[PDB]
Design a protein around this ligand. Structure first.
Ligand SMILES: [Hg+2]
Ligand SMILES: [Hg+2]
Ligand SMILES: [Hg+2]
Ligand SMILES: [Hg+2]
Ligand SMILES: [Hg+2]
Ligand SMILES: [Hg+2]
Ligand SMILES: [Hg+2]
Ligand SMILES: [Hg+2]
Ligand SMILES: [Hg+2]
Ligand SMILES: [Hg+2]
Ligand SMILES: [Hg+2]
Ligand SMILES: [Hg+2]
Ligand SMILES: [Hg+2]
Ligand SMILES: [Hg+2]
Ligand SMILES: [Mn+2]
Ligand SMILES: [Mn+2]
Ligand SMILES: [Mn+2]
Ligand SMILES: [Mn+2]
Lengths: 339, 339
């Protein structure tokens, strides 16, 4: 029941962010929430081309790196690449079919587009520091440690996408599909979208930043300068992305948008909390693999763990959730220089 | 079912463009078809911002235009805006769930992104030539003369999207849904994709170009020059988009990418021919409405009609279809100054 151009003349200022009438005319002279137009405008102002960044000295740097530091650097990079691959396509596939206001539809497409640029920047780095990129790319798919840390991301998107197709195809109600009873609840689909967004928020605001810290640890040593420039550019974009998800989530929570979404956010709040706690643990467990061959001065399991708790508390407070970790000062204040 | 990250390590160089394993890793160091990587790079190199184009004198030009000329200009503008609205979201929603090679997936997202910029440029023009943009935007949705192709265009996309969902959810076979038999055939889905791409090819290659002729007719008289500068940039982008669809179609019909599609294409060749001619006829009929109050310098029903046949012959030959019209030289050579 999805349509690429709804024929009903509707007031786009009165539609909910999600599950309303599919967006027909793409107009940018007005909006229900100007924050999304501001984000589009900002993201477009930050346009950059990865291949332009000089990474010619990164190969020399990387090669001269101690084997365990090469492991740390490359493992971190492979994970970042995995996340960008997923983020380049997922916002579009999972959210586009559910958006009902123009400013948000375009923001998602612009956000997704910027992620593909991030993916392109990683190919630029990889092909300029290793002999055969295929070994790195193939390992991204097979490496159990990497998939372990990312476990739950693709699965959630996939479930939302499948439920969305059922909704568009069958509509609300209880159906019989190949002799099986299939329930299609809009309320349940809204919950799935809401939690998916919370998961994306944790991905954008936590997972990416933990990886930035690892990348910048080398920048502090005056090594991998090209990669550092790229990470700074990526981080600038990620800041906009997480601002977008925090606003989507807090607007839904306020009750100023879909009233039902406000109820759902409230009733499903323990689930929001649980997903952050789980994401944090996954980022922490990754330390065992990252530092399996040894750690670096100023970068080890303890420091990584401390940073995960530090940033997780900050991000959770931003969306109104209780803090799971003990409060503490930034364990790596040097990262500010790069953000 | 569809997945945002296929867990199977596959050779992306051997996958078909569509219907193969969903793309997992987004890499750009290699391609099965380098044309898509080349298009991504070219499109990125062409990035432009609408707001940076001076359209300050277009308002006075518009107000000074004879009433029928305002009709010609604004009617054409509304149709272009309609097409961009559809093109900004549709390639992503319709193609992303079916692509199996990375270069094509990212090209589609880049292509779609560029279309959203075009939509933004139309808001920029509209808000600078009319007092209340809402009048223009609302008419785009309900305008009977405009909302005719939109229906046909959106139909091909909507049908492909719906059948794609059934395929991902139920797979091939004869199913039952609420007492009704539902047949899912990959062959029919492949045909729907081919028809959809052919329709998009006609949209990018003919529909947009016919509209450019009208916009530049004003440019030739040194009027609506802000609009003209924006259309020049848009046309530069559409050239890339049509190149992309032409390669997709030719690769699918040749049999080099998927024998089944090649078999299907030959089977529905007459249908695609009629589909193309129908699009040309619709563009032609638009003249009765466009020049109902009168015509202008270098632009009239007959000239437009000639240009439609001229461009259609070229585009159809480019994708292996017979020529439906009498051959002849460009009826409006002056258009080359802008294209
Ligand atoms: Hg998600
Ligand atoms: Hg999500
Ligand atoms: Hg780290
Ligand atoms: Hg929740
Ligand atoms: Hg919550
Ligand atoms: Hg800790
Ligand atoms: Hg299509
Ligand atoms: Hg189509
Ligand atoms: Hg025209
Ligand atoms: Hg024309
Ligand atoms: Hg056909
Ligand atoms: Hg054909
Ligand atoms: Hg004609
Ligand atoms: Hg003609
Ligand atoms: Mn990113
Ligand atoms: Mn992001
Ligand atoms: Mn366009
Ligand atoms: Mn186009």
């Amino acid at each position: 029941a999805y349509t690429t151009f709804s024929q009903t003349k509707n007031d786009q200022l009165k539609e909910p962010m999600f599950f309303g009438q599919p967006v027909n005319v793409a107009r940018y002279d007005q909006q229900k929430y100007d924050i999304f137009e501001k984000l589009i405008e900002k993201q477009l102002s930050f346009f950059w081309r990865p291949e332009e960044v000089d990474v010619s000295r990164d190969r020399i740097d990387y090669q001269a790196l101690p084997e365990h530091e090469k492991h740390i650097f490359i493992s971190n990079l492979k994970y970042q690449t995995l996340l960008e691959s997923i983020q380049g396509r997922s916002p579009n596939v999972a959210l586009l079919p559910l958006i009902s206001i123009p400013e948000l539809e375009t923001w998602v497409e612009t956000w997704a587009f910027s992620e593909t640029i991030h993916s392109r920047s990683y190919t630029h780095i990889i092909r300029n520091i290793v002999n055969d990129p295929s070994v790195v790319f193939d390992d991204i798919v097979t490496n159990e440690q990497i998939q372990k840390r990312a476990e739950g991301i693709s699965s959630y998107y996939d479930e939302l996408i499948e439920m969305t197709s059922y909704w568009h195809l069958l509509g609300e109600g209880t159906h019989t599909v190949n002799g099986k009873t299939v329930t299609v609840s809009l309320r349940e689909l809204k919950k799935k979208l809401y939690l998916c967004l919370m998961s994306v928020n944790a991905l954008e605001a936590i997972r990416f930043y933990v990886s930035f810290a690892c990348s910048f640890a080398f920048a502090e040593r005056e090594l991998m300068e090209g990669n550092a420039k790229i990470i700074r550019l990526i981080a600038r974009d990620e800041a906009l992305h997480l601002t977008g998800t925090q606003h989507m989530l807090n607007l839904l929570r306020s009750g100023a948008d879909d009233p039902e979404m406000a109820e759902i956010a409230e009733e499903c709040k323990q689930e929001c909390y649980d997903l952050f706690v789980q994401a944090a643990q996954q980022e922490k467990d990754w330390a065992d693999y990252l530092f399996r061959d040894g750690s670096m001065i100023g970068l080890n399991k303890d420091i990584l763990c401390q940073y995960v708790e530090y940033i997780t508390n900050i991000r959770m407070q931003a969306v109104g959730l209780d803090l799971p970790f003990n409060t503490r000062s930034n364990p790596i204040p040097w990262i500010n220089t790069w953000l």
